[PDB]
Ligand binder design. Structure first.
Ligand SMILES: COc1ccc(Cc2n[nH]c(=S)[nH]c2=S)cc1
Length: 135
């Protein structure tokens, strides 16, 4: 049967980005990775099997994959090579992904808005908005 996380499932392509270089700077990403990652045009592939959600990010820069259960912490190696402890929950229909490392924290929110999947990335004060559409 259906679940509310159904509206996220599918294959999504990046269609716009704003402020991503400044977000990456705030996170601590170095120059060369920021340039190559900022050029990426990832696809995001989201699937669900039982309680396990899988999110893949695929681009010329990096191919990543995370699988998780809502509310249950996991260790993640990010595309920019941070080793983080992540927890993802659903808060009023928004997937909220918190990454903790070296005493720092960033939050990535994913929500459905019209036919878009909007990704908002926040690192102290700095937000980047990345908009995806169905592939
Ligand atoms: C903090 O620097 C980062 C750099 C790149 C990535 C990979 C990625 N994943 N997801 C989206 S929306 N876009 C991209 S390019 C992740 C973090």
């Amino acid at each position: 049967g259906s679940h509310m996380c159904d509206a996220f499932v599918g294959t999504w392509k990046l269609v716009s980005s704003e402020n991503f270089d400044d977000y990456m700077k705030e996170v601590g990403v170095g120059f060369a990775t920021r340039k190559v990652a900022g050029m990426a045009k990832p696809n995001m592939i989201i699937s669900v099997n039982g309680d396990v959600i899988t999110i893949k990010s695929e681009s010329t820069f990096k191919n990543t994959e995370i699988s998780f259960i809502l509310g249950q912490e996991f260790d993640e190696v990010t595309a920019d090579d941070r080793k983080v402890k992540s927890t993802i929950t659903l808060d009023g229909g928004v997937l909220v992904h918190v990454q903790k490392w070296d005493g720092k924290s960033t939050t990535i929110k994913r929500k459905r808005e019209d036919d878009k999947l909007v990704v908002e990335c926040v690192m102290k004060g700095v937000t980047s908005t990345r908009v995806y559409e169905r592939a």
